[PDB]
Amino acid sequence: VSPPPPIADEPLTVNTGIYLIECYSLDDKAETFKVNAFLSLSWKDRRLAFDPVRSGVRVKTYEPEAIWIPEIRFVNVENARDADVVDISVSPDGTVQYLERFSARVLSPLDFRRYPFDSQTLHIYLIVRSVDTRNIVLAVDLEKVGKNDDVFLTGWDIESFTAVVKPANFALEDRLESKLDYQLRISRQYFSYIPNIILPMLFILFISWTAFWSTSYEANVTLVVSTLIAHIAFNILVETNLPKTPYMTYTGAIIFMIYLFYFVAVIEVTVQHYLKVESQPARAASITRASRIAFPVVFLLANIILAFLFF
Template sequence: MLKSKRVIKFFVCWWLAVCVCFVVSFAFEGKAQEGGKTEVISQVPKVENVGGKNRQNEKASRSEERVNKGGEKDEDLTTLPPNGGKPVEVSVGVHITNFAAIDEAKENYEVVGYLKAAWKDAHLAFDAKNERQKYRFHDLEKVWHPFLEFVNKAGENNVDNALIVADPDGMVSFSEGFNIKLSSDFDFKRFPFDRQKLKIAIESFRYDETEVVFIAKPKNSGLSKDNFVSLSEWKIENFTQKVVNNKLVTEENPVSRFVGELDIVRNYQFYVGKVFIPMFLIVVISGACFWIDIEYFEALTAIGLTNLLTAIAFSLSIAGSLPKVSYLTFIDGFITISYVFIFLTIIEIVWAHYFSQKGDKEVAESSHRKGRWAFPAGFILGNLFLGLFLFMPS
């Protein structure tokens, strides 16, 4: 009876040690992710630094040009619109027509849509009655515009069309069709039950906030309702927008920045049916070994080893469908816990057989019976701890 208690304590200690190891590892992993997390729209310093230098140089040259020309009246249409010394207010919006692709390994995505902006320019006002025109079309290079660019772009921006239209009162509307890859900050710790916020960051390449200030207008932004907008694996929930001030190292004044956030949720049904259920069944088969008498040692050993090799082969076959990240995701933790408990089943079978061969059959049978409830309880608790640490709010 004493030996039986020692064996039970041994296995309880092992299972507790495994659970504690997973809890500690994921706790430190979460802290590391929180500590190292940076906003993605500041991941392109080279582009911003070059833009900052250009803004400073061009701002100085524009001031000198005004002095030489003797004021704003003699300036051409490409100069800043007169606004009484205040910065020009530019409303910015993004209308998404297609969420084309997402690359989880490179942490970027491809999106198609329209970039829209509007501002007031007295230079372009005209008399609609005399000229018999409701609006005027202008060449982009011949009139002033805020030089909008995507800060977090990960590839070349393919511009389909660009248009500038001025109303009689000088209200200017700008529209540009784009097809671009953008980088974003992905967090796959909860994969495949994760949701992502894909960011679209837009700044003026040429002007800081003393000259241009962005204004977010919801009516200028939105999502197309066409069926082809979403990807099969992702569902678009919402698109929000805001304007923030971004302070660059190379500039004295911050830059106005438009930030659009595309909220997407992964459709997890594929992974439940193709990964979780098959792996769970393999674990259940291993747990069934505790219901077979320890006398059938060869059969129990064969079942345990076969399950372990099957689990390894299965995980290798699905590796291409998992995100290639340096930290553990929920699905990685689930597969690892399955490995551990399949392996512990084999250890328990060998341990019970050892006691049986020594003639202490009572201890062997007792530990084997305890595994009937200890195995599923430990497996469930291990995954509960995993889920708690990954799904609890930061």
């Protein structure tokens, strides 16, 4: 009901911990993720302490209204952290052990440049408002911060749940206070993405390259233009998986390069035909023969240039 008084000017230390139970709804369209976890809080209140003989027990259980509880909030959430309280335990020395289970949609930006190899740092920002009586400071209890054996992250590898031990104060408000950051490092699992996106997209492009082993302009126009359609169609097919980014992505640059290669292949096919029709088939045959090596080499070279630029 009333905040604990400081014996001295020192601020109240609230030890925090988050135990990740379930992580669902990874909607990449809104750069959000839903979380279901345990939030543990630990701080010392002298007013609740006792001798354990006359009191009988070693522990004292209270209701949330009965005692003072710090106003802990999450910064980067859609709406107020949905909560329910599990337990409040007071040890003989006056140390309060608070535990609640919560579920909330977290706002955490995603970098899609490295995609689909990309690594992400998912953030959960904890915050406390200091009162006049008293100031309150947050701390991390590493024993209460953990991932379960049943933790499921389908399509991602969980690297480190290591929260920011030194979380800098956000100078947003009039009074600056330290906001405890929880860094959750993940890296994209990619096996499926080669046989489902890259490989079939390379096959369609390679099919267009058969126009370099043909002399029929009609058959060549069909090869290049119809594969171009198949490529667009294939992009529409995988559209859901690829990201809608306002910046240039690695995947996006490859896609653009593929569009350029269809254009150049058309030029070649058109040129080869023009030379043959304009009575110089020696040149026409030489260009086509060269393209057979030029196109794969330049492609492989440019992909290495791209890979280097992004990694």
